[PDB]
Each structure stands twice: as structure tokens, then as C-alpha cells.
């Protein structure tokens with residue numbers, strides 16, 4: 179199975195998922211001086227007031243919080259998007275040390291972690307259909323740097339001990355993802371892909387310029403998770419990030435000057 183190790187990591191994924199070498203792969207380095215301000219871009223509309231979180235799960239490659247996506251409860255619209263995108267789940271990518279962990283980079287800078295809020299276009303009816311469409315998904319990416327704690331992240335951090343190994347899940351109701359968002363919704367956007375297999379080229383990426391700060395204690399709890407299932411040799415879930423991929427024939431647009 180694919181993973182992040184020497185023998186099954188990102189450099190191997192193309193063998194099972196040949197689109198890994200495709201024309202719109204993610205993540206990418208965001209060269210801030212080359213991204214063009216696009217005044218036609220609209221402000222992002224993040225409507226999370228009615229979000230219904232359901233469960234938190236260790237899937238062997240990250241941990242994810244899943245939401246009820248059977249109704250327009252927590253939706254993303256505006257920005258570069260046409261139509262309405264329902265929040266399905268969020269998860270993180272992080273490093274073994276604070277100097278790596280993000281998937282996107284900014285002028286080659288790596289952040290300690292990156293949060294992905296994954297949404298799918300309601301015109302396609304379900305996420306499985308959406309993944310087969312070039313505009314099927316919108317992933318809101320938020321960088322994490324280490325400094326002050328993020329209070330809205332603590333409820334997530336405190337339950338991670340109950341999902342240490344692959345396959346574990348827990349009830350995770352009444353979590354408000356608005357507590358994970360930075361002040362500014364200034365963003366970069368570009369057409370890309372899922373960053374884990376199957377690497378489908380179905381995503382409009384919306385990457386916020388402003389990171390959130392999390393504390394060393396919060397990220398250290400991420401690093402206690404395990405890639406392995408219970409009973410297997412313990413392998414810390416760290417460095418679950420795909421490196422930046424070739425930009426190829428793509429322009430990154432900025433919502434801000």
C-alpha cells in the first residue's frame with residue numbers, strides 16, 4: 179500500500195497512479211512574486227455556521243474530521259468557484275520537525291503543517307462523482323506555524339490519543355471549524371489535484387495567505403499518532419506530506435495585491 183516511507187512514498191506513487199506525473203498535480207510552490215493579482219476574483223464565502231461534524235478517524239495517512247454533507251450546511255462559494263461546495267472533511271499534513279510538514283510552499287518556505295478543508299461541488303451530487311470532474315472539489319488550504327496555541331484546535335488535539343493507530347475512530351460532534359480559520363481570507367488559487375492517491379485532477383485549490391499559529395504542544399500531539407495499525411511495529415505518523423510538484427502550464431492567481 180502507498181504511504182510516505184522510503185519504499186512506498188510519493189516518489190513511488192506514479193506506479194499505481196500514473197496521473198502522479200500529470201499536468202495539474204498538487205501541491206506546488208507558490209512563488210508570490212509570480213502569482214498575478216486578479217481583481218476579477220471575488221471574496222471567498224465560507225459559510226460554516228451550520229456545520230455538523232460527525233466523527234474523527236485515523237486512516238493511516240492522516241487524521242480526518244468528517245461532516246454531514248447530505249445538505250448545504252457548511253458550504254464554500256465565491257472566490258474562484260462557480261456554484262456551491264459542501265464541506266465533507268478536514269485533515270492535516272505535518273512534519274517530524276517544525277521546518278517541514280506543509281504540502282504547498284510559499285517562496286519555497288515550508289510550514290510546520292497544513293490544514294485541508296475538503297469540499298465537493300453539489301452539481302455532481304456526491305463526492306465520488308465530483309472526483310471525476312475537473313471542477314469537482316475545492317480544497318481550502320491553511321498553513322500552520324508554531325508559536326501561540328490555536329484555542330479552536332484544542333478539542334481536536336485532545337481526542338487524538340483515542341485514535342492513535344490506523345483504523346481507529348471516535349464520535350466528534352459539535353466541532354466548529356470556524357475556530358481553525360485565520361483573520362484574513364486573502365488567498366492564492368490554481369487548478370490542481372488531490373495530494374494523496376488517487377491524485378485525481380479534480381481540485382480548485384484555495385490556499386490562504388495568512389497562516390494560523392498553533393503551539394508546540396498541539397503539533398507534538400499530531401506527531402504521536404501512528405501510521406501503523408494496533409499490534410504492528412510503531413511508526414510515528416509524521417512527514418505525511420507530498421512535496422511540491424511541477425507547475426507546468428498553470429498560473430497561480432492572487433486575490434490580493
Ligand SMILES: CC(C)C(=O)Nc1nnc(S(N)(=O)=O)s1
Pocket residue numbers: 266267294296305309317371372373374375376
Ligand atoms: C473524500 C475523499 C474523496 C477525499 O477527500 N480525498 C482526498 N484525497 N487528497 C485530498 S487533499 N490532501 O488534496 O486535500 S482529499
Ligand SMILES: [Zn+2]
Pocket residue numbers: 269270271294373
Ligand atoms: Zn490533504
